[PDB]
């Protein structure tokens, strides 16, 4: 019993961070196999962060501009090149604690762990979800750069984040590995800002599926609704649109708790035009969506790593 | 900026987690040089959960009924203890993976991270507070038993909770790593319950500092209280007094952002009188109680955001 924000366990990840200094410059890098990752601005220079011309800062760069400490060895730079937005190092010793890994690139409403840095040294793991506005509601301070976000199965690591920079709002942006943005963010110093955001319709639905499956049920209902009815009900409330592949993902849930996803629909339209009346749900009093269909399955079924 | 329930990286934790089998009974085991700790509770049978007397059924088992799986290692065991509820398998092999750690008995209100684990693997990583009423409000199935609590400030495992049982409520019961329980609990089937629990009023005060120190003041007053005024009015809200020792630990988030531990007290009885007229903080709807000064301060710029 028990609902909370759960992460992966981020051992595999921790033995990946190495610390990554050119210059006055310091971050955080991914080692595996013998290549190190990072941002490319790692190379910026406050005056450069304004209007970078980086291929023309890469090209003035050597390999021995590069400081790469793994805990207190240092590894030594061989190669270095661009990849979009993300820096590679090649380095000459192969990270003996390489977990098998793939790159892979996110969709909105995804969630993944991160493995909050400093300085090459992990800090902290927490829970996110990419946002609909491409952003990510992180926790992060000056130098958290290079951190990295992640999901597990099995025992394979899919890296899909690498963050890069902070947005006025206080949230976050990043890369994936591959070094291609999530969002219309570029790595400079310039106006840029977060648009305005949507909450993720799919996710609450989990969400109220897990309450359900924990005990909490105050907000079901005798009604049924049709997709078509309940997405004119999520255009006005700023929630994303449900489609056909949302219900048939949450399939699983509807035939456990015996809500159908319209059904389920039905509540949530419900809880968006009336509020929850002073109640809670799962211990919130506001709808969660950070939750995917799968967070819920695997925390409600115990699937190990 | 931003403020997320951020956990401990749990990796030094995960190289430690194994699982115990005796019987038709399988559970988690923490293995830390050459002895594995787990719930003396491994050993009870499935037809008397109501009473079981461990030293009874612990003189008639040989070590080889003990069966520990390290990932696809079986440890062989070689001898055995029971140290309060806690039982302690001596095994031929010492974990070459042990951290540095300690062992720390904590307080009501103070937080840890949780490793949660099934057949000896890790299944995810959370946050968690030790309520006033002495359980924790886990995320825990079947099987979770033996999995850990725990903190790792400046490098060193202090492990200070291991799952023992799931209460009426659905919240959790434990103990140290010493064997004693948290709270009046034991580690039978009985109709314990836990009692009314209740908001720990210290760690919703540091996060109301944290939202200071990440931009945010729309709740504060022009008001102050005194402490015995400000407790008068928390307990009528099942809140948790505040002490003088609560106070001092405030002092330096107090420092940090200029306001006074008891203006920020009248700031919170104010909270309690009106509700948040839809505005959140740090992105709850409720005021949050699981994150402690030493969170906060842990987690937060070390510059407010004026
Ligand atoms: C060069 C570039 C792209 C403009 C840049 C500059 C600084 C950083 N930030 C580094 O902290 C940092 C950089 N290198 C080591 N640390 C921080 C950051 O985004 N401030 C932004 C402030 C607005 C203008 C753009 C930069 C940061 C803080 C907290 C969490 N995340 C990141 C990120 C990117
Ligand atoms: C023998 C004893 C002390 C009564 C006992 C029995 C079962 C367990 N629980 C094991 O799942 C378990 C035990 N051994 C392997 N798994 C579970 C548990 O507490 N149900 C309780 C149900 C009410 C009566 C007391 C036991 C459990 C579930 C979810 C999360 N946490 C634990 C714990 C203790
Ligand atoms: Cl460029
Ligand atoms: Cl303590
Ligand atoms: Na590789
Ligand atoms: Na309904």
């Known amino acids: 019993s028990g609902f909370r924000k759960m992460a992966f366990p981020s051992g595999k990840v921790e033995g990946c961070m190495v610390q990554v200094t050119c210059g006055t410059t310091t971050l955080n890098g991914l080692w595996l196999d013998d290549v190190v990752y990072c941002p490319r601005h790692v190379i910026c220079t406050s005056e450069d962060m304004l209007n970078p011309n980086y291929e023309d800062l890469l090209i003035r760069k050597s390999n021995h501009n ?68 491409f952003t990510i509601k992180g926790s992060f301070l000056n130098g958290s750069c290079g951190s990295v976000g992640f999901n597990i199965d099995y025992d394979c690591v899919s890296f ?12 976050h942006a990043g890369t994936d590995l591959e070094g291609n943005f999530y969002g219309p963010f570029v790595d400079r110093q310039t106006a840029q800002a977060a648009g305005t ?76 035009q009336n509020g929850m009346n002073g109640r809670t749900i799962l211990g919130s009093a506001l709808l969660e969506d950070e939750f995917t269909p799968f967070d819920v399955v695997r925390q409600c079924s115990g699937v190990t790593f």
């Not at 309940?230 to 699983?252: C, R, S, W």
């Not at 015996?258 to 509540?267: E, K, T, Y």
Request: hydrophobic share 40%; glycine share 6%; aromatic share 10%.
């Open 66 to 133: 590069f400081l790469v400490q793994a805990g207190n060895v240092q590894l030594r730079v061989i190669g270095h090149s661009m990849q979009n937005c993300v820096l590679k190092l090649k380095v000459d010793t192969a990270n003996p604690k390489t977990p098998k890994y793939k790159f892979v690139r996110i969709q909105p409403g995804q969630t993944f762990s991160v493995l909050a840095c400093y300085n090459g040294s992990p800090s902290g793991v927490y829970q996110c979800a990419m946002r609909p506005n």
């Open 160 to 171: 899909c984040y690498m963050h890069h920079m902070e947005l006025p709002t206080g949230v």
């Open 197 to 272: 955001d949507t909450t993720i319709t799919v996710n609450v639905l989990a969400w109220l599926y897990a309450a359900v499956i924990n005990g909490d049920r105050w907000f079901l209902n005798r009604f049924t609704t049709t997709l078509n009815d309940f997405n004119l009900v999520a255009m006005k409330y700023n929630y994303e649109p449900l489609t056909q592949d949302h219900v048939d993902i949450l399939g699983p849930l509807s035939a456990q708790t015996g809500i159908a996803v319209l059904d389920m629909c039905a509540s949530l339209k419900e809880l968006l």
